């Protein structure tokens, strides 16, 4: 079990750690979160009470260092930092725990949501999408645009997701225009899976990360990326059977976890109706289809 201490909480803020959220009042004696499961990436995120604009947060893995949060009154946000002095850190954390100034990450996984949402998400891959190599953790927020969005402006602060574009030379082999556009299997399997991602685990990892950034920060370009990566699989006639079964599980837990009140802005009607009802894989996503129909039948 690991800990992310907080120097203090000078400004009123809703804090979230994965799918959990809680409120901290202005200058309430809060000194972080403890009992954080080792073995998964995590995201700690923030929404200031006084400006709900700019949700922002940090992806991290506690195995990669000792991390804490400290408010910066100049830049106006809660910042993640690494403490390199390990003795100093254990001491701080032990005192804060003794004083019970830390909220406890629940040891109540029954609804196995975080593992299922982050199964293929690796911190090393996150750090390639979010370039800031001096830090072991990765900052994301509502407004960051993707490489593909900037093609259609600050590159250092961009989400470097893998560019998918169904009407591109990469996607369409000369001489197979109609074949490759109506059945994207070449693009998925040879270009993307074999060529760029290397394996389906890395593909699913980016898909899951894009969804999580869309859900936790309302990052629109991440939502575009999540739907693109779904649509590329659903629009391929030839997909390994193990990828389809896993995709169905991935999407099930994403739909299960999405706030009911955010379905209007985070779910693209066209992609989902296509994928569940028109695509090659229309019959291969049983769990996802059943939850979608019972929870968001209006979308469909």
């Amino acid at each position: 079990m690991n800990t992310v201490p907080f120097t203090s909480a000078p400004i009123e803020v809703t804090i979230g750690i994965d799918q959990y959220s809680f409120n901290v009042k202005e200058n309430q004696p809060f000194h972080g979160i403890k009992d954080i499961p080792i073995g998964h990436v995590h995201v700690i995120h923030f929404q200031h009470a006084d400006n709900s604009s700019m949700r922002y947060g940090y992806w991290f893995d506690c195995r990669m260092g000792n991390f804490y949060i400290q408010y910066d009154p100049k830049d106006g946000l809660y910042k993640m930092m690494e403490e390199r002095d390990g003795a100093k850190f254990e001491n701080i954390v032990h005192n804060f725990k003794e004083r019970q100034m830390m909220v406890s990450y629940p040891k109540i996984d029954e609804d196995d949501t975080w593992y299922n949402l982050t199964e293929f998400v690796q911190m090393d891959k996150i750090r390639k999408i979010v370039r800031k190599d001096e830090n072991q953790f990765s900052y994301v927020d509502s407004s960051m645009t993707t490489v593909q969005e900037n093609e259609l402006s600050d590159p250092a602060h961009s989400l470097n997701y893998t560019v998918i574009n169904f009407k591109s030379r990469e996607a369409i082999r000369p001489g197979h225009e109609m074949e490759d556009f109506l059945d994207k299997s070449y693009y998925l399997n040879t270009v993307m899976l074999q060529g760029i991602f290397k394996n389906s685990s890395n593909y699913f990892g980016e898909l899951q990360f894009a969804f999580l950034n869309a859900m936790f920060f309302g990052n629109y370009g991440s939502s575009l990326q999540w739907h693109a990566m779904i649509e590329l699989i659903c629009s391929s006639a030839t997909v390994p059977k193990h990828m389809l079964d896993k995709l169905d599980e991935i999407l099930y837990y994403q739909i299960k976890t999405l706030p009911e009140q955010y379905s209007d802005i985070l779910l693209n009607e066209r992609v989902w109706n296509i994928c569940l009802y028109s695509s090659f894989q229309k019959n291969s996503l049983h769990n996802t289809e059943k939850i979608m129909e019972n929870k968001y039948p209006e979308l469909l």
Partner: protein, 237 residues
């Protein structure tokens, strides 16, 4: 974006552009089988690719053999159209290649865009106009060259005959669309109008009769009457 009434004069500026109409690419007769089921028999078709400024119709004849052994022919027909149009652009010198291709039906947009990926600078555009190009097969000689073909074949010719010697491309296109709209609404009547006077002939290399300016005004008026007529015969007005 799309082509409509408001930006009509762009058709006649000096940027090379083509209309592509695919409505006569895949053509069938529907008939009953001996068992009493229904079957289609394909007949030859054509892609109608028109420079509206110069009158150049790159008529690509689609022989029935191109459908042999193929499924979902109406969908393939749009991709075949796009393949042929792309091949036509590639065959033209750089300075003759269009800067825009306007498709008369929206379903052609994706097939053409995908076939034209090599030409990022050529704009593929839809239009809001209800253009009568489907009636091109009501032009006698044009129907005859398409129905006589025994193999794939391209015919380049001016669909406006020599009219541009005497009138602007705007006026020529308006005449063409009026003739084609008439032929589409009542072919027999429209053709009767065009030929009633045997002294006005069609040059061996022309589609339309050698009308004088004054006779074209009369002709053009008679085609409008027809279109209004039929519209009353249709709606009872």
């Amino acid at each position: 974006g799309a082509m409509n009434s408001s930006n009509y004069a762009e058709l006649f500026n000096n940027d090379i552009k083509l209309f592509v109409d695919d409505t006569n690419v895949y053509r069938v007769t529907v008939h009953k089988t001996f068992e009493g089921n229904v079957a289609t028999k394909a007949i030859n078709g054509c892609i109608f690719t028109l420079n509206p400024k110069t009158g150049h119709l790159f008529l690509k004849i689609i022989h029935t053999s191109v459908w042999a052994g193929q499924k979902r022919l109406s969908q393939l027909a749009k991709w075949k159209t796009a393949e042929e149009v792309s091949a036509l652009v590639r065959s033209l010198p750089k300075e003759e290649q269009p800067k825009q291709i306007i498709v008369t039906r929206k379903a052609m947009l994706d097939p053409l865009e995908v076939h034209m990926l090599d030409f990022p600078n050529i704009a593929i555009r839809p239009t809001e106009l209800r253009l009568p190009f489907s009636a091109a097969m009501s032009i006698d000689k044009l129907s005859d060259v398409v129905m006589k073909a025994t193999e794939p074949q391209m015919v380049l010719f001016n669909i406006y005959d020599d009219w541009l010697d005497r009138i602007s491309s705007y006026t020529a296109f308006s005449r063409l669309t009026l003739l084609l709209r008439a032929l589409k609404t009542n072919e027999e009547s429209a053709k009767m109008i065009l030929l009633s006077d045997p002294t006005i002939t069609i040059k061996s290399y022309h589609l339309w009769p050698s009308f004088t300016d004054e006779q074209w005004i009369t002709i053009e008026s008679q085609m409008r009457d027809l279109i209004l007529t039929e519209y009353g015969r249709k709606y009872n007005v």
